[PDB]
Amino acid sequence: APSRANTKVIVVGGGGTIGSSTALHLVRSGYTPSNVTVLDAYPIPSSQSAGNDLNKIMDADADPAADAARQMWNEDELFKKFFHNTGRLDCCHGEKDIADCKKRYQNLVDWGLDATVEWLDSEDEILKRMPQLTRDQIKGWKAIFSKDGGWLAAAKAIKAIGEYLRDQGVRFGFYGAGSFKQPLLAEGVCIGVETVDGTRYYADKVVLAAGAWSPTLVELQEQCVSKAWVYGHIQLTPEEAARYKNSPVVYNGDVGFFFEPNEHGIIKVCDEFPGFTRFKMHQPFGAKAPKRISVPRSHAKHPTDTIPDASIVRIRRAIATFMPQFKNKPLFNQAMCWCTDTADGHLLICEHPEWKNFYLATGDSGDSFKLLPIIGKYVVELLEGTLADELAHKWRWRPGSGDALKSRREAPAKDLADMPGWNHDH
Ligand SMILES: *Cc1cc2c(cc1C)nc1c(=O)[nH]c(=O)nc-1n2C[C@H](O)[C@H](O)[C@H](O)COP(=O)(O)OP(=O)(O)OC[C@H]1O[C@@H](n2cnc3c(N)ncnc32)[C@H](O)[C@@H]1O
């Protein structure tokens, strides 16, 4: 095994979240930049990466990886500017959701103290916190307000990683030169990657950080099932947008959520739901025949795609509830954004059980963007044989460990074949 300075690594999906972090941590660890090759279907930040977004939520997860990430969002100079500490307003209505939120709030008063969390026990208490809401839309609502967390400028953070890597001299391959087709195996040892255009890249170690595409590219035995979530955007005038400067993330699990406007006055609005699959026949490397698996329907490949009609209705209901004064604004740049769920919702970060020096770094399960600053550190540890055993176990190769179609969500994902309104191919 060579020294870090002499080790060649290929990061497949290095234009995405986990992949770009991996490349960053290899460089920060003293790998020689020109020995690191980032391969992606699309140039960093990849136009189909789940992290290519105006915003993501940063919550207050006590988990060690989430904690370490939070410290870097606060303190690391590459990342800090992209974390917006607006807090979060979690709204609840109906007996069931209110009971759940009260229990959750009590757990904070119990477990690791409250401190930065408030209970809002009426409409008027919510309005004092967020005067931009409309009373007649929030009848019977209560809320938890958390001063911790807020939102992350996701595409900008990945873009900042790519500029850093570029300036260090990392090597890149994109499009046909970056789209993984197969590992290169020599008697059960991975020694590189071949791309769609026929280019062959050789390295000591290969990381597959291909997000929702990972189970399409190599045989993962249904350990990961790929699903889409949805959003769209509305455009506020400068005067309208000023009202929502530093506004908290607003969330109601029965409705959806929205963010503070970006610097161009655009609000992104999301639904809350268990995700959509898109099953079709496909043959990943390592599969003996085509199989029915959920294959992302990429908005980058298909920019005329929007989102299902059902989704538009839900997002319109969210705007009508949270921002009734903006109900006549067009919802634009509608898109589907893909992730991959494991059965238990933990990551899949492990060496392949048959292909030595080929490593999986996926299973993001819809809540990994917030790990961008830290996650590559754990991937480097895996490559070097130093990942903490409890994490190695939690993130292990585990086919047959449960049904990832439902995962730890409320319901099995429905399928885009059954959800009209997104496809505008003709
Ligand atoms: C979709 C989504 C996700 C999301 C979210 C809202 C939506 C609508 N809200 C979040 C939130 O509030 N907080 C949070 O922490 N996470 C949230 N998420 C999830 C998050 O976006 C994902 O968990 C995370 O971004 C996933 O990272 P991962 O690195 O696994 O995936 P990726 O960024 O999509 O990157 C994968 C890359 O692989 C490349 N690719 C695909 N095929 C190939 C081939 N053949 N060859 C080479 N590269 C390939 C992609 O192009 C991509 O760059």
Numbering used by the authors: 2 to 427
The authors write:
The inability of wild type FPOXs to act on intact proteins is the most critical issue limiting both their diabetes detection efficiency and their protein deglycation potential. This is due to their buried active site and narrow access tunnel, as determined in multiple crystal structures. In that account, using a rational design approach involving a five-amino acid deletion at the entrance of the active site and a number of further mutations, we described a stable PnFPOX mutant (named L3-35A) that, relative to the wild type enzyme, features a significantly wider and shorter access tunnel.
We observed that the activity of the enzyme variants towards fK and fV remained similar to that of the parent enzyme, with a slight increase of activity in the case of D02 and a slight decrease in all the other cases. Overall, we observed that the activity of these mutant enzymes is several folds lower than that of PnFPOX, the naturally occurring enzyme. Also, similarly to the parent enzyme, none of these mutants shows any activity towards the dipeptide or the hexapeptide. In this process, while the amino acids that are directly involved in the catalytic function were not modified, some tunnel-lining residues were replaced.
